[PDB]
Amino acid sequence: SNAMKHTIGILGGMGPAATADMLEKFVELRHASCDQQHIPLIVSSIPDIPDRTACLLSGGPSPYRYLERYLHMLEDAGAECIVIPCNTAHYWFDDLQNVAKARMISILDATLGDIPPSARHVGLLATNATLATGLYQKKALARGLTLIQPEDAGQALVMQAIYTLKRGDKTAAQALLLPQIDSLIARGAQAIIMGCTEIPLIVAGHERAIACPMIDSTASLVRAAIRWYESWPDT
Amino acid sequence: AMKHTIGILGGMGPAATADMLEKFVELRHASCDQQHIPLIVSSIPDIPDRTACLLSGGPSPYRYLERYLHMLEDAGAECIVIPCNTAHYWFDDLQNVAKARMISILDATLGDIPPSARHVGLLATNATLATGLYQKKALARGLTLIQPEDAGQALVMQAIYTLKRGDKTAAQALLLPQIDSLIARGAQAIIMGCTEIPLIVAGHERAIACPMIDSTASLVRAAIRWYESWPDT
Ligand SMILES: OC[C@H]1O[C@@](CO)(O[C@H]2O[C@H](CO)[C@@H](O)[C@H](O)[C@H]2O)[C@@H](O)[C@@H]1O
Ligand SMILES: [Mg+2]
Numbered sequence: 049s050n051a052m053k054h055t056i057g058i059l060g061g062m063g064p065a066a067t068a069d070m071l072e073k074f075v076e077l078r079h080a081s082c083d084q085q086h087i088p089l090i091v092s093s094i095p096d097i098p099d100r101t102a103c104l105l106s107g108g109p110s111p112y113r114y115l116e117r118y119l120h121m122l123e124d125a126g127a128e129c130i131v132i133p134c135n136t137a138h139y140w141f142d143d144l145q146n147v148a149k150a151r152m153i154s155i156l157d158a159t160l161g162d163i164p165p166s167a168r169h170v171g172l173l174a175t176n177a178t179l180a181t182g183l184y185q186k187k188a189l190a191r192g193l194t195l196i197q198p199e200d201a202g203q204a205l206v207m208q209a210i211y212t213l214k215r216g217d218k219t220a221a222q223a224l225l226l227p228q229i230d231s232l233i234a235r236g237a238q239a240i241i242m243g244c245t246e247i248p249l250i251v252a253g254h255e256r257a258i259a260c261p262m263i264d265s266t267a268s269l270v271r272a273a274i275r276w277y278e279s280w281p282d283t
Numbered sequence: 284a285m286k287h288t289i290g291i292l293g294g295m296g297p298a299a300t301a302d303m304l305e306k307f308v309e310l311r312h313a314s315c316d317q318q319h320i321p322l323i324v325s326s327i328p329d330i331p332d333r334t335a336c337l338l339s340g341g342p343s344p345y346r347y348l349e350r351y352l353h354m355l356e357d358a359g360a361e362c363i364v365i366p367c368n369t370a371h372y373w374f375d376d377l378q379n380v381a382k383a384r385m386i387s388i389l390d391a392t393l394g395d396i397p398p399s400a401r402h403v404g405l406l407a408t409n410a411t412l413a414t415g416l417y418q419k420k421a422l423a424r425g426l427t428l429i430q431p432e433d434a435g436q437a438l439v440m441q442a443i444y445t446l447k448r449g450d451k452t453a454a455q456a457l458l459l460p461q462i463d464s465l466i467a468r469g470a471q472a473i474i475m476g477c478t479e480i481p482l483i484v485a486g487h488e489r490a491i492a493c494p495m496i497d498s499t500a501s502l503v504r505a506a507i508r509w510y511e512s513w514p515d516t
Contacts, residue, residue, distance in 0.1 A: 049327050049354050063316035068304035071326065075298045075449070083296040083328045083447055090354075091324035093304065094285050095316045121284055121323075125358050214316055216308070 049126040053088050054280050056273050057127025057150065059118050061093040062100065062111075062134035063214045066245035066266065068093075070133040073270045087277055090125050092118040100136035101177040101207075112140050116147060123150050131155070131273050133245045133266055136175045138183055151276065155245075156187055158272035159265040163239055167261070169194045171237035173228070174244045176207050184243060196237050202228050213246040221250045226257075233259050241265065284359025285321040287513050289506050290383065292351050294326040295333065295344075295367035296447045299478035299499065301326075303366040306503045320510055323358050325351040333369035334410035334440075345373050349380060356383050364388070364506050366478045366499055369408045371416055384509065389420055391505040392498040396426070396472055400494070404429045404470035406461070407477045409440055417476060429470055435461050446479040454483045459490075466493050474498065 049055055060067030071091065080086045097115065102108030115137065122130060129151040132138065138156055145152050163170060172184060172195045179197055188195050198206055209225035225247070232240055239261045242248050248264045255262060277283055293300030304324065313319045330348065335341035348370065355363060362384040365371065371389055378385045396403060405417060405428045412430055421428050431439055442457035458480070465473055474496045475481050481497045488495060510516060 049325065049351055053327070053329070055327065061316065061319070061321075064304070064319045064322075065308045068301060068308055071297070071301035071304055071324075075301060081448060082444075083294065083330070083332070086294070086297045086326075086328040088327040088329065089294075089297075089324070091304075091322070091326065093319075093324065094288065094321040095319040096285055096321065097316075099315070099317070118284075121358050125354055211315075215314065 049088070049090065051126050051128050053126070054128050054277055054283060055088040055090055055126045056277060057122030057125070057130045058089060058091040059115065059122060059130055059132045060091055061095040062097055062137055063246060064093050064095050065213065065249055066133050067091065069245070069249055070266050070270060073267050074274070077267065077270050078274055087274060090122055090127050092122055094118060100134065100139070101175045104136070104139060104177040104181055111137065112143065115140055115144055119144055119148060123148070129153065129273065129276055131269050133269065135183065135243050135245060135265055136178045139177070139181055153269065153272050153276060155265050155269045156184060158268040159241060159243070159263060160187055160191055160193070162268040162271070163193070163241070163263050164261065167238035168192070169196060169236055169238050171196045171232035171240035172243050173206055173240060173247050175210060176203065178243060179203070184241070196232060196235055198228050198231065202231055209250055210244050210246050213250050218250060222254070225250050226254065229258055239263055284323065287362070287510055287516060288321040288323055288360050289510060290355030290358070290360025290363045291322060291324040292348065292355060292363055292365045293324055294328040295330055295370055296479065297326050297328050298446065298482055299366050300324065302478070302482055303499050303503060306500050307507070310500065310503050311507055320507060323355055323360050325355055327351060333367065333372070334408045337369070337372060337410040338413055344370065345376065348373055348377055352377055352381060356381070362386065362506065362509050364502050366502065368416065368476050368478060368498055369411045372410070372414055386502065386505050386509060388498050388502045389416060391501040392474060392476070392496060393417070393420055393424055393426070395501040395504070396474070396496055397494065400471035401425065402427050402429060402469050402471050404465035404473035405476050406439055406473060406480050408443060409436065411476060412436070417474070429465060429468055431461050431464060435464055442483060443477050443479050446483050451483060455487070458483050459487065462491060472496055
């Protein structure tokens, strides 16, 4: 668990299914000949972190002091680099980066970096809060992208899909989400960002039925963390 | 950290550890994220190969296990579970050094076998079989364990390490005929006694004529029971 081992901490639990999905992806995306070749990881999946959207939109209790606590726990355990598999939680990214000893890597930049340069007009599937606070907007503008978001009726259904997956019914979530993906495509999306970490779990298996490339924010962050680990002269 | 947090001392291998987290989500009833089990996970895979140590004279995993155990405790884990069957060779030693509660995969798994199944197949690593980890516990319960013959066990071992290398399709081609052989030999149930096995079998249970007992899922259920036994949870 050495710091000199370049251990990656996952500040997770938002939600727990997305965190488990990230772990599976670290295994998938890392080239390894055996157990011992995989990436060293310490994971916090401690879900009591208050709901991010309720905080931002309703003035519910802030997740910030939980994130800070669990970040220091990971650092104290030896994590040299920290990744957060929750898009909405990146509202607090800069604040956490101010207090962090460990390197931090943003899901937002990793995700935008994984969009083909030819897709200028890009759908965005995310929580109401990620949209309302514009987490992707400045970075997308800088890259010369136009973000396409579901209109109000559609967005409510996307939000319901996310929370339905969070409650554990994937089938019901899919029936809610898939029609919203087609609407984005019908409106001209050249790719669609899955900008909430439950979305890839809902979509999994249907990519073939979907006419445009889906950009997986969780997988993008995993790839970035892998590059970070692999950059070291001793790894 | 959180009250009654469960540490997972994982990474053996990492795919099985990920499978364990998925199962904690599946098997816990929760109204929302905030009702899920608090977990801190070590998946730090540099732990030396368990079977290689035991049958091949390779370096011992023990000191790694002890280190990461303390790490989890220091992070606030009050109960520790290990999603590797072969690593239970060291369970008693770890429990001695542990302040936190520990829950054995072996007992959790045997306790989930239907009482009607007397003659049970066992899919596990060579080391788990050779050191008899399941053996004494099973006999106490009146079970008779059936294991593959030499040739078949080499293929089970190959399947496990093939999954560990990341090819599930090749692992399945290797494993499935060994499952059929156990049933042909009269297995009333089969213990998947290696945490990679459920990953290989997943998607095939219907094709399989007898119940498979998932060691990972058994351990998860036992940890959930431990967590829910707290009056302040
Ligand atoms: O847009 C760049 C901006 O993003 C931040 C985090 O908000 O860092 C991200 O981008 C960097 C350069 O691409 C990466 O090295 C880094 O890992 C990623 O988090 C800021 O640091 C930076 O100003
Ligand atoms: Mg390197």
